[PDB]
Amino acid sequence: LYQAPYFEKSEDEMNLITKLLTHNVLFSFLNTKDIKVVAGAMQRATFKHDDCIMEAGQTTCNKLYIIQSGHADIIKEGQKVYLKTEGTAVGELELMYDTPVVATVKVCTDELIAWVLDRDTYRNLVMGTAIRRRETYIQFLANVPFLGGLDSYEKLQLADALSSEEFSPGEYIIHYGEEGEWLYIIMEGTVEVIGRDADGEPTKVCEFTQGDHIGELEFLNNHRTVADVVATTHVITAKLNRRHFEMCLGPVIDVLKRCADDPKYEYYQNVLKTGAAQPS
Template sequence: MSAADHQMYIQTKINPVLEALVTQTLLERPEDPVPFMVDWLCKQASKDGELPEVKKLKGEVEELKNRIRVLEGGGNLGKSEVEDEEDEDDDEDEDEVGDLPEFTQVNRGRGPRASVSAEAYGAWNKKDTEFKAPVYEKTEDQVTRIKGVLANSFLFSALEAKDLETVILAMQEKTLKAKERPICQGDDGDVLYVVEKGILDCYKKFDGESDEKLVKTCEVGDVFGELALLYNCPRAASVEARDDAVVWSLDRESFNAIVKDAASKKRELYDKFLTSVPLLESMDAYERNKIADALKTETFSDGDFICKQGDPGDKFFLLEDGEAVATKAFVEGQEPKEVMKYKTGDYFGELALLKNEPRAANVIAKGSCRCAFLDRKSFKRLLGPLEDILRRATDRYN
């Protein structure tokens, strides 16, 4: 199968399934998306025995596996060799594509959102390694406004300050009149939009129905149009301004080069660190990736208070680099005493979140240090399965 055949197959077979799956997931917005998506795929497969797309996809998967083995091994592999290697890899690699009807056995992710996925690159779709983002000059006021808007969007949460600045400069302002549609269902899409002002309604016409249905409402800080960029598929719905609105657009090339790459780099950066944290050793790569997506970073200088005794606690910290000490005043008015030391890979701040109480001690940076942290909501969502372990571990403070 040639590169052109692969591209045609992706566009005509895989993308329609992915588009329908992602659209339905966004419409339902399940608390735990992975089981929902698995269940949806299984239901589609069982409607008429098995969808033709699914049936053909499984055959293509086997063929692609064989081709990958040949390319990696530098020679031809017989069927038995491929099957032997596949049996071994299936046990080791959770990312391998399995038999679709068995998806009901999967029970992973516990979060409310999926992560930014990467576009497939190959002979048919070369990645631009020398990309330079466009620059559209903006006033300081506009930059400040855009920063405020992007702060409310998880899609841009992985960006470092430099990348965020590049994205802001690459965005173009677009004013919309009431009832104007920047996106129409079925059109090709090469930009996404972030809402700065106004409300926009998303309408979708389902197969067999003549009228559009309101499926979602976008408000300030919301992103729309990203599906076409994430999955290289036509627009899944139409978006209409309810009243006059202001949005900022970002083109596909800038999105791929900056936003997607930033999310990928962040995962790679944190994967080794999270693997070294004893608390997380029972988690698999998928679960660690979800934690990496949610982590934010703070740096502290020598003597800085990371936590203060008596303050409300809304963050769970992982000491990413450096050292810190915990001090506690056992009697009000007395000097705090050192009660614990922390090194790279240690965690703290969980007591206030587990017990919904003020901070029980101070944590002070000893030299320069960097901490990754989860907010209260992410802590409950991602580390909920470890709550028993965390509660048992509180004995270390006694």
Template sequence: MNFEIPPGLTDLLQDFTVAVLKDRPDDLIRFAAEYFNKLNTNRDDIEKSDKHRGVRFSSPANEPMQTEQEDDDDEPMPEPPPRRGERRKSVSAERYDPEADDTSSDEKIVFPKSDDQRQRLSEAVEPILLFRSLEPEQMQDVLDAMFERRVQPGIHVIDQGDDGDNFYVIDSGTYDIHVDNKLVGQYENSGSFGELALMYNMPRAATIVATSDGTLWAMDRSTFRRIVLKNAFNKRKLYEGLLECVPMLKALDPYERMNIADALLTKTYKDNEIIIRQGDGADCMYIVEDGEVRITVKNKNRPDLDEVEVKRCMKGDYFGELALVTHKPRAATAYAVGKTKCAVLDVQAFERLLGPCMDIMKRNIDEYEEQLVTVFGSAANISDLR
């Protein structure tokens, strides 16, 4: 499926990103609502007052307005931010379509590294959200494709308004973040930057200046897109197909299922490995992506009895949601049968995205308790089994 970016969306997202970097709001959703409401109000006011003067409206709230006459004047207008240069056209024209990208996965870029370098790089990329959904093999491609760059105090790693060339991960050193020549933040020995320009085909939204000797790991634009963006696209397609097979999620519209697909992460388990353990706290639910899962229960009142298998989960089946609904410990243990992959949805995303399915999941609790009564007798209930 091909998606055409609507005119003005890139500019709008960039201006909002800059506003967030400047103000660093505690409540991002409220800040976004106020920002776009104000932007819309300003536009309406300007269009009403200037509709007879030939003024063209520009989407950024902080961009100077220009008339057609002023475009031809020799007198300079107030200097706009450097990101408003002609380079924007060349960047936004280079739209990346993951579906049309037929780059072979065998065409890998490898920069040799010592064991120490590879270890440092592994530690640096571990907390980066962009890489959380990558398979181990893809993560190795990331490590292979990144190259080392050493910097000294005063070096501009990226400049606001420039085209995006590399994505950077900080190994060591301190770096100031400037937006419109104002200091808005700092990185210290950790972090990453530069992905927005590569993901959204926009000029750099900030200037990053080294304030000490340091080391960065960099990945070029094309490799970043091939590994990170194409993987994210393929992952979404895979998960959307998987979610369509989950009966509970038929209550959701396609957009809601897409949001769930973006929030899922893959975990792989070996044969007989425990996925969840009865009595443990609950922090996520699972959907079987590939393989098989057996669910067992042990009655705490009869410790002499072995665990009893109560269910098998196949591809598209889900488990682990009951403890999230009841806010109680796990009521059963889940084992992988053979090599098994599960799509995992953490508790925060579960509560945010699965509200429309909550009634269905509560009904599942009653069905589950009836199943346990069949296994353990009429006195059994979920609380008895912990």
């Protein structure tokens, strides 16, 4: 029965805002209508350098801010600890765990333009099962090797955008020569990567299993997929959409780019030097 506030926006505002939402993991699993209601309930909020959007200990905030342009530091006990850039959010932690502001947010650029959501609209139309989704993945993600370089906060950020994807033996996870919109982290089962050799014929490259990742090549290097990935067993994966890849795997991209060196990626090395793929 909840009806949200509405503040009319120009056609470019709704467009701009809707884009920030579909790339911020707080809103990953909202349908199209609820994405728009949310964009109408947002409000502009501009800040200047050294301005504080919130302060450690504050109880008077209770708002979620999505950054449009500009940066802002996270300061916990006098120490800067995190830089918040465009597309990111401050305030979600207080809204999800109902506690006073834990850290101070200090604009470190000449201006900061935010879009601000009220607690009532977030808890009723966004949050959903956020805490349970976090319970589903964090212990797993904490044990996934290539995620070593995310801190607890970043793993939770990733868990907020994850959903569970199962595959039947022999079903395609990824098809050769397609755009590809998901990275997969195997939780259970085994997969085979089926490339194409010089005459264009199927060739098996390797297998992958629990804790391995597939999908990232095309996101690192902006080409269509260069292999099939097929389940050899019943497979369970957690999956991350392409629009969330950079916002969430940012601090580990460089582990991913060791695809240039690892010999399991020798197939792909040879594909890259002969230029055998198109952008997507």
